[PDB]
Design a protein around this ligand. Structure first.
Ligand code: GOJ
Length: 119
């Protein structure tokens, strides 16, 4: 029933993601000195520190908006990878599976709480 509960649930999931070794390449914005052509390929950079900062600033209205930004971290890695066998892309796929497994109940509970609110 709690329409605000998603925020702490997302904070806790972000904490789990930061402890995951698979999140290392994605914890901060991609370094343009390490990947000089990055912005030629990727239009909208995104990383987990930016997601956490947006959440903590009260700049997400719903968990769907947070989920769109986290999914952008993964689609950027898939677009930038030179190979479907690359180390960083392989880390993104495992981290995406972990994220999707945990965000599903957050989205469901929020949408159900919102439907109850507008009943
Ligand atoms: C973090 C920026 O780099 C990537 O996303 C990447 C690099 N190789 N495969 C994917």
């Amino acid at each position: 029933y709690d329409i605000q509960a998603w925020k702490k649930q997302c904070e806790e999931l972000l904490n789990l993601i930061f402890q995951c070794e698979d999140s290392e390449p994605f914890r901060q914005p991609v370094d343009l000195l390490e990947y000089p052509d990055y912005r030629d390929i990727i239009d909208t950079p995104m990383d987990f520190a930016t997601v956490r900062e947006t959440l903590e600033a009260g700049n997400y209205e719903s968990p769907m908006e947070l989920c769109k930004d986290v999914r952008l971290i993964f689609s950027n890695s898939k677009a930038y990878t030179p190979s479907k066998r690359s180390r960083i892309y392989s880390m993104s796929l495992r981290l995406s599976a972990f994220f999707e497994e945990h965000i599903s109940s957050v989205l469901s509970d929020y949408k159900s709480a919102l439907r109850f609110h507008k009943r």
